[PDB]
Amino acid sequence: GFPWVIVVGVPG
Amino acid sequence: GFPWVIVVGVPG
Amino acid sequence: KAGSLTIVGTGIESIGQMTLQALSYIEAAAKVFYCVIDPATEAFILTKNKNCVDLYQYYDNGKSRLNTYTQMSELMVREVRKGLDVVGVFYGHPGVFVNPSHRALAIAKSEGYRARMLPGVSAEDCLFADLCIDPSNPGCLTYEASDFLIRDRPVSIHSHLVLFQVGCVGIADFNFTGFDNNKFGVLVDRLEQEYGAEHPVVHYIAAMMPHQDPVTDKYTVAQLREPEIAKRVGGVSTFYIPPKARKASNLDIIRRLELRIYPANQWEPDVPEVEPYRPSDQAAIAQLADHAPPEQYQPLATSKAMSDVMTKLALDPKALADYKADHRAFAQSVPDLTPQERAALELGDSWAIRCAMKNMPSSLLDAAR
Amino acid sequence: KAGSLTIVGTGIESIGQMTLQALSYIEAAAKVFYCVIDPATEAFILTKNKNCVDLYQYYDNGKSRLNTYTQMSELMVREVRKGLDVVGVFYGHPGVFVNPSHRALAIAKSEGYRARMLPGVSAEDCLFADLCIDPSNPGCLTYEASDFLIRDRPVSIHSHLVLFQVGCVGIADFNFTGFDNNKFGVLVDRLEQEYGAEHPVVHYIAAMMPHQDPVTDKYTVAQLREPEIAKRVGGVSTFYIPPKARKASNLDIIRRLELRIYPANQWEPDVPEVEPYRPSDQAAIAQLADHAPPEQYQPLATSKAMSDVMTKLALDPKALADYKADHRAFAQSVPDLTPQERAALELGDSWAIRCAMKNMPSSLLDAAR
Ligand SMILES: Nc1ncnc2c1ncn2[C@@H]1O[C@H](CSCC[C@H](N)C(=O)O)[C@@H](O)[C@H]1O
Ligand SMILES: Nc1ncnc2c1ncn2[C@@H]1O[C@H](CSCC[C@H](N)C(=O)O)[C@@H](O)[C@H]1O
């Protein structure tokens, strides 16, 4: 059921 | 004291 | 100086992929901050420590993840500055595609506090287990999907490719009902350019719960444009792109060194069948009949007392802190130890412990200086 | 059909880096085969199961490792064919630079037996924790040192490089008193060619024992020719080669997507100092004062009974086997469950379990179909 636990992002 | 437990080798 | 930060991992699959050291550090912590996905893992953690805070609540719809990550990182560092032993908990490996852990430790370190990351089982660790591949053969390139696109990072058609965060191409923010991943097609274009329309791409999702099966669905690069297929990719989707070809061996390097292995990589296209039981395999197995341990092989020869104390040091961070502060003091006080066991503890080094725990052959010892 | 093979890992550091699922699978096994380095880990394993065999005894001086690996792989498969539930145990991750695990599973699978690898904490997992790096930033290339040389595998000066088995370049065999690693200079030549004499190389050895410190010694590529330095490399040595430069961002890809992070990689040469508390960081932290959990945030709201059973499924492979064979049967029989908890178990899917364990906002639910 759409799990979304993103713990990093890149330049933007 | 020189531990050596290599569990893979490559073509050779 | 008072105050420390230890970041640990839970692994990917619920509870069971947490290491013993992660669990013991959680129990010993003054204050725990966690970011996990499944609520059994969360409930498990709450049984282990009174003072937990869920970091997941610092995410929000339309809220940039950098904000969330600064906030997570600051909540941990603040309790460090109050002199507390703080444990941070992140799903998987706390340092693999995780900003706020590296962030909180670098801050803690730059202000002179004890600052440690314990490793854990990553999604890539799971990928290798579940898809039955070995990074070593034939090598591994690992990228965040968007960084891959934005800095035009080189692929190798002769080595494994692992792509994290394929479910949020270009997305700097967060939403509790996921995202469309409208820029997905952009990745699919880069893959076709580098590998080609027919080239295999494995959609990998590691089971999160003990009873569930992984997703290990192979698609063509071109199939990823079908809406029905593209929509199966989400926030916990990882892509594995196998090699397109074996790479010729180098003649010059073989000389200087004075010179397929089963099993084949099953996700590789036009992969030839590899024989398990070749002659050298059959000869290796025939030897088992008469096999004795070689002379220099050193059997375990230890005691319940030494076994118990070496377990305690690994599992009881209080036992470890005593030992770390005075080897000889600690050793003297452990009951039912042989002098050889006490001596090994007083020295601390791997050789001494091996000599005390193993029946060392007269041969190995000889080597010495 | 009767008989199964499960391969698990112990992690790198003694006992503590074993996962809970690894430990429970070892306890439940009919026959255990292990290949670990330190004897505390070995002694620990022997307390957990009666029927263990040390696979380390199938190594020998001058004996080709392929022979050893075929022999290890066959000893496991044979007990599988007798109808037994066999657990193999390898240090670290049982599938990361490990032939005999992949070998034994592919054989077990090709003869129609249940065949599973559980992931574990690899040396690369430890490397990331101990050297404070993240594969994601700026990407990771991982190779076996000799395969790197022999197939002339491409490096990226803009991404992390990890080299396993730098202590046995060109060596197909084994020796209980290690090796000279005479072909080491060959690797050092390849590194200078690709990175240059002054470029940093980190000599990484993860602490094996709880009380020990890692080796994280930086050298120049040129320093690796000094005999005193080269001789410190051994069978458990891994090299980390940081990037030489940040890679320019791509103008074209930024457009299609409609568009340093702290901390800096400390092993990178001429690395600029990165500010932790920039404005957006200061603004993110100011928000903490008035922060409430967002509406769509879903707090844990579960019971001791549901917590206990979800823990059992993760930690008790017998509990799991019942559940896997009949969800509804298993759920009916668990005591002190609410209907909502029983229902979630009967369905098995992550959403139902999340609804039963979390206080879901009216919003998230709405999404539905
Ligand atoms: N169950 C799962 N199966 C596959 N990939 C997963 C996963 N859970 C997380 N990931 C990967 O991890 C990304 C988030 S980044 C966090 C990674 C985590 N620290 C780890 O150790 O793996 C996801 O976008 C996906 O690429
Ligand atoms: N303590 C340690 N520190 C650093 N690298 C290590 C290590 N123990 C093993 N390795 C690496 O692993 C190689 C053997 S291959 C076995 C790897 C193991 N399955 C894992 O999960 O990591 C060594 O040559 C070295 O490159």
The three-class DSSP label of residue D117 is: strand
The nearest CA of chain D is from the CA of B6 a distance in Å of 7
Ligand 2 near D48 CB (within 6 A):
no
C79 & C192 share domain: no
Residues of C in contact with D209 (CB under 8 A): 313, 348, 350, 353
Amino acid at D341: E
D107 & D136 share domain: no
The answer to whether residue D297 sits within a structural domain is: no
Distance CA D344, CA D337 (A): 10
Distance CA D72, CA D33 (A): 8
The three-class DSSP label of residue D197 is: coil
- CATH code at C249? 3.30.950.10
The answer to whether residue C89 sits within a structural domain is: yes
Q: Report which of C83, C144, C39, C134 is spatially closest to residue D311, judged by C-alpha positions.
A: C39
Distance CA C32, CA C7 (A): 10
Structure-token match 């004062």, residue found: D289
Q: Does C298 touch chain B (CB under 8 A)?
A: no
**C325, burial (CB in 10 Å: exposed 0-12, middle 13-18, buried 19+):** exposed
SS3 content of chain C, % helix, strand, coil (to 5): 40, 15, 45
Ligand 1 near C12 CB (within 6 A):
yes
Method of determination used here: X-ray
DSSP run (H or E) holding C116: strand C114-117
The answer to whether residue C299 sits within a structural domain is: no
Q: Report which of D89, D121, D138, D15 is spatially closest to residue C125, judged by C-alpha positions.
A: D121
Closest residue on chain A to C72 (Cα): A7
Beta bridge partners of C140: C160, D142
Distance CA C158, CA C246 (A): 6
Residue positions counted in chain B: 12
D208 & D279 share domain: yes
Token reading at D312: 């059992």
Q: Where are the beta strands (DSSP E) in B1-12?
A: none
The answer to whether residue C130 sits within a structural domain is: yes
Token reading at D243: 């990037």
Q: Report which of D35, D8, D37 is spatially closest to residue D23, judged by C-alpha positions.
A: D8
The answer to whether residue C298 sits within a structural domain is: no
Token reading at D68: 């050893």
The three-class DSSP label of residue D303 is: coil
Q: Report which of C184, C186, C223, C185 is spatially closest to residue C201, judged by C-alpha positions.
A: C223
Are the CB atoms for D93 and C136 separated by under 8 Å?
no
**C258, burial (CB in 10 Å: exposed 0-12, middle 13-18, buried 19+):** exposed
Q: How many CB atoms lie within 10 A of CB D1?
A: 8
Distance CA C174, CA D292 (A): 17
Backbone φ and ψ of D220, nearest 5°: -75, 155
D138 & D265 share domain: yes
Q: Report which of D315, D102, D43 is spatially closest to residue C356, judged by C-alpha positions.
A: D43
Closest residue on chain A to C176 (Cα): A4
The answer to whether residue D298 sits within a structural domain is: no
The answer to whether residue D22 sits within a structural domain is: yes
D313 & D258 share domain: no
**A12, burial (CB in 10 Å: exposed 0-12, middle 13-18, buried 19+):** middle
Are the CB atoms for C310 and D92 separated by under 8 Å?
no
Look up the domain containing D27 and give its range. 4-121
D163 & D277 share domain: yes
Query: Nearest residue CA, atom 14 of ligand 1?
Result: A6
DSSP string, D120-154: ---HHHHHHHHTT-BTTBT-EEEEEHHHHHHTTPP
Are the CB atoms for D156 and D132 separated by under 8 Å?
no
Amino acid at D44: F
All residues at 6 or more sequence positions from D240 whose CB lies less than 8 Å from its CB, including other chains: D127, D131, D133, D160, D161, D162, D201, D202, D204, D267
The number of angstroms, rounded, from the C-alpha of D74 to the middle of its chain's C-alpha atoms is 25
Residue positions counted in chain A: 12
The three-class DSSP label of residue D114 is: strand
Closest residue on chain A to D353 (Cα): A1
Domain-ending residue, one of D121, D140, D170: D121
D97 & D164 share domain: no
C10 & C69 share domain: yes
The three-class DSSP label of residue D189 is: helix
Strands D52-54 and D215-220: unpaired
Residues of A in contact with D261 (CB under 8 A): 9-11
The three-class DSSP label of residue D93 is: coil
All residues at 6 or more sequence positions from C333 whose CB lies less than 8 Å from its CB, including other chains: none
Ligand 2 near D179 CB (within 6 A):
no
Structure-token match 């490096």, residue found: D155
Distance CA C151, CA D7 (A): 38
All residues at 6 or more sequence positions from D236 whose CB lies less than 8 Å from its CB, including other chains: B3, B4, B5, D37, D123, D167, D205, D206, D208
DSSP string, D1-40: ---EEEEEE-BSSTTTTSBHHHHHHHHH-SEEEEE-SSHH
**Alpha-helix residue ranges (DSSP H) falling in chain D:** 20-28, 39-48, 65-81, 99-110, 123-130, 145-150, 184-194, 227-230, 251-256, 279-286, 304-315, 317-325, 327-333, 339-347, 350-357, 364-367
Distance CA D122, CA C156 (A): 23
C52-54 sheet: strands from edge to edge:
C52-54, C31-35, C85-90, C4-9, C114-117
The answer to whether residue D155 sits within a structural domain is: yes
Angle value at C-alpha C82, between C81 and C84, nearest 5 degrees: 95
D185 & D205 share domain: yes
Residues of C in contact with A4 (CB under 8 A): 167-168, 174-176, 178-179, 234-236
HSE-CB for C311 with a 13 A CA cutoff: 14
Does D96 show up as a binding residue in the annotation? Answer: yes
Q: Report which of C48, C11, C17 is spatially closest to residue C32, judged by C-alpha positions.
A: C48
Are the CB atoms for D343 and D356 separated by under 8 Å?
yes
Domain-ending residue, one of C264, C291, C318: C291
Q: How many CB atoms lie within 10 A of CB D227?
A: 6
Residue A4 and residue C99: Cβ atoms within 8 Å? no
Among the partner-chain residues A1, A8, A11, the one whose CB lies closest to the CB of D350 is: A1
Task: Report the nearest atom of ligand 2 relative to the CA of D124.
Answer: 22
Are the CB atoms for C360 and C298 separated by under 8 Å?
yes
D298 vs A2, D11, D195, D294, D302, CA distance in Å?
A: 14, 34, 49, 9, 12
Distance CA C215, CA D238 (A): 32
Ligand 1 near A6 CB (within 6 A):
yes
The three-class DSSP label of residue C362 is: coil
SS3 content of chain B, % helix, strand, coil (to 5): 0, 0, 100
C130 & C244 share domain: yes
Beta bridge partners of C217: C203
Are the CB atoms for D260 and D273 separated by under 8 Å?
no
Ligand 1 near C105 CB (within 6 A):
no
D342 & D332 share domain: yes
Token reading at D296: 């769509």
Residues of C identified as active-site: 65, 69, 91
Q: Report which of D60, D64, D98 is spatially closest to residue D176, judged by C-alpha positions.
A: D60
D73 & D165 share domain: no
Token reading at C103: 């962030």
- CATH code at D98? 3.40.1010.10
Are the CB atoms for D12 and D19 separated by under 8 Å?
no
Helices C304-315 and C339-347: crossing angle in degrees, nearest 10, is: 30
Strands C140-144 and D215-220: unpaired
The three-class DSSP label of residue C306 is: helix
Residue A8 and residue D257: Cβ atoms within 8 Å? no
Angle value at C-alpha C183, between C177 and C186, nearest 5 degrees: 150
> What resolution in Å is listed for this PDB structure?
2.2
Peptide-bond breaks in chain D following residues (C–N over 2.5 A): 259
Q: Report which of D46, D93, C298 is spatially closest to residue B3, judged by C-alpha positions.
A: C298
Q: Report which of D106, D314, D279, D222 is spatially closest to residue C70, judged by C-alpha positions.
A: D279
Backbone φ and ψ of D273, nearest 5°: -65, 130
Distance CA A11, CA D259 (A): 10
Are the CB atoms for D260 and C173 separated by under 8 Å?
no
Domain-ending residue, one of C270, C291, C312: C291
All residues at 6 or more sequence positions from C52 whose CB lies less than 8 Å from its CB, including other chains: C32, C33, C34, C45, C46
Structure-token match 């130890």, residue found: C337
Are the CB atoms for C138 and C158 separated by under 8 Å?
yes
Distance CA D181, CA D231 (A): 9
Among the partner-chain residues A1, A3, A8, the one whose CB lies closest to the CB of D136 is: A8
Residue C150 and residue D121: Cβ atoms within 8 Å? no
Are the CB atoms for C219 and C229 separated by under 8 Å?
yes
Number of independent structural domains in chain C: 3
The three-class DSSP label of residue D168 is: helix
Task: Report the nearest atom of ligand 2 relative to the CA of D204.
Answer: 4
Rounded to a whole number, what is the largest CA-CA distance in chain B?
29
Are the CB atoms for C334 and C309 separated by under 8 Å?
yes
DSSP string, C193-236: HHT-TTSEEEEEE--SSTTPPPEEEEEETGGGGSHHHHTT--TT
Residue C37 and residue A6: Cβ atoms within 8 Å? no
Are the CB atoms for D176 and D189 separated by under 8 Å?
no
Distance CA C84, CA C267 (A): 49
Residues of A in contact with D349 (CB under 8 A): 1
